[PDB]
Design an enzyme around this catalytic site. Structure first.
Site, PDB file in Angstrom:
ATOM      1  N   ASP B  25       0.813  -1.203   0.000  1.00 19.72           N
ATOM      2  CA  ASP B  25       0.000   0.000   0.000  1.00 19.72           C
ATOM      3  C   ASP B  25       0.850   1.257   0.000  1.00 19.72           C
ATOM      4  OD1 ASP B  25      -1.860   1.958   0.287  1.00 19.72           O
ATOM      5  OD2 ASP B  25      -2.684   1.214   2.170  1.00 19.72           O
ATOM      6  N   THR B  26       1.086   1.772  -1.194  1.00 18.55           N
ATOM      7  CA  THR B  26       1.856   3.008  -1.339  1.00 18.55           C
ATOM      8  C   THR B  26       1.168   4.252  -0.747  1.00 18.55           C
ATOM      9  OG1 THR B  26       1.002   3.453  -3.582  1.00 18.55           O
ATOM     10  CG2 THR B  26       3.073   2.122  -3.366  1.00 18.55           C
ATOM     11  N   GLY B  27      -0.125   4.133  -0.467  1.00 20.67           N
ATOM     12  CA  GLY B  27      -0.893   5.210   0.158  1.00 20.67           C
ATOM     13  C   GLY B  27      -0.783   5.277   1.664  1.00 20.67           C
TER      14      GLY B  27
END
Lengths: 4, 99, 99
Positions: B25-27
């Site tokens: 999850d780059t967020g």
């Protein structure tokens, strides 16, 4: 903010 | 590996000797796992996202193996809807976004 | 381009005639924008994240340019704290995770  | 995004980027991780499935999850600034026991001291913290803030337990300097790559860093534990590997560990395994 | 994850992966997008900053978010199924008065028909939706659910407006077949790469698809508008580009558009621009 922090955890999307 | 190169992982495309037609499906959720779920991978197997190992942590505290146990296998789990987690979302790359780059967020997420931080790594947040569903309720579980981890060894050592933890500190209460709050983190936010869509839907607001939750309470978590912060464990520092925890080894996590992600798709065969080693990381050692902060893991938050709490009522997350899914196990999330965030940028704090993605950076350690050399993960980048490419297009 | 290649985007490292030391910082939040914020990029410029163009949507409904506005340039905005948005987070490339491999954890998000959908693309969710901060409140904006977009024209067109929409349907109500509820989307969940770390702290619970928020109510959003779903707009279909909206053109969105992400770092110069054209996309077109569903965009959700509501009280997210951050503009987020989800997998529905990341796949259209050929975005991968690589380590």
């Amino acid at each position: 903010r922090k955890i999307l | 590996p190169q992982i495309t995004l037609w499906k959720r980027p779920l991978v197997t991780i190992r942590i505290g000797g146990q296998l789990k499935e987690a979302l790359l999850d780059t967020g997420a600034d931080d790594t947040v796992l569903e309720e579980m026991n981890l060894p050592g001291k933890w500190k209460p913290k709050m983190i936010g996202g869509i839907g607001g803030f939750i309470k978590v337990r912060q464990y520092d300097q925890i080894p996590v193996e992600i798709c065969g790559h080693k990381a050692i860093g902060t893991v938050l534990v709490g009522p997350t809807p899914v196990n999330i590997i965030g940028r704090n560990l993605l950076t350690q395994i050399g993960c980048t976004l490419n297009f």
